[model samples]
Target: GCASRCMKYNDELEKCEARMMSDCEQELEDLLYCLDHC
Candidate 1:
């Protein structure tokens, strides 16, 4: 059985892109770094 905390963690992991690129800071720099490196 998934605890509430586990469920919330899973949900966040699933929406990582929206969270990281939507409202979080440092998102653009991180994305740029990944693109540059890859």
Candidate 2:
């Protein structure tokens, strides 16, 4: 359940990395949030 949620955030984070590593602050935090949930 939580891993799936992490996938959601990871996608956004990856996109943030490629599209704009400039501002992944939200995505980073968001991803970590989901990761920690598991």
Candidate 3:
């Protein structure tokens, strides 16, 4: 799921030059939470 999100963001950026980027801020926050707890 994470990888799919990542690739979607990457591919879309290269394909059409989006006006905005995907918001992965919450995803990064969750990753940091996991790392801190782990």
lDDT of 3 by residue, 1-38 (tens): 34543554455444443433435454455545544552
Model 2: worst 10 consecutive residues (lDDT sum):
15-24
In model 3, how large is the Cα lDDT of residue 33?
Answer: 53
lDDT of 2 at 21: 42
Name model 2 segments beyond 4 Å from true. none
Models 1 onward score TM values of 0.34, 0.65, 0.39
Ranking under TM-score, best-scoring first? Answer: 2, 3, 1
**Worst lDDT window (10 residues) for model 1?**
1-10
Give the local distance difference test score of model 1.
Answer: 0.48
Per-model C-alpha lDDT, please? 0.48, 0.82, 0.47
* Candidate 3 Cα lDDT to native: 0.47
Report clash pairs, candidate 2: none
Writing each residue's lDDT as its tens digit, candidate 1 over 1-38 gives 22443444445454776666675334545444444553
* Prediction 2 TM-score vs. true: 0.65
Give model 3's TM-score versus the native structure.
0.39
